[PDB]
Amino acid sequence: XXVXXXXXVXXFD
């Protein structure tokens, strides 16, 4: 996984 812009499971806005 990791950090940026895309789609899946985690913490995002």
Place this chain on the structure above:
Amino acid sequence: XXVXXXXXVXXFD
């Protein structure tokens, strides 16, 4: 957004 499944900017694992 927040913690869950979907699309945007953040951390995905």
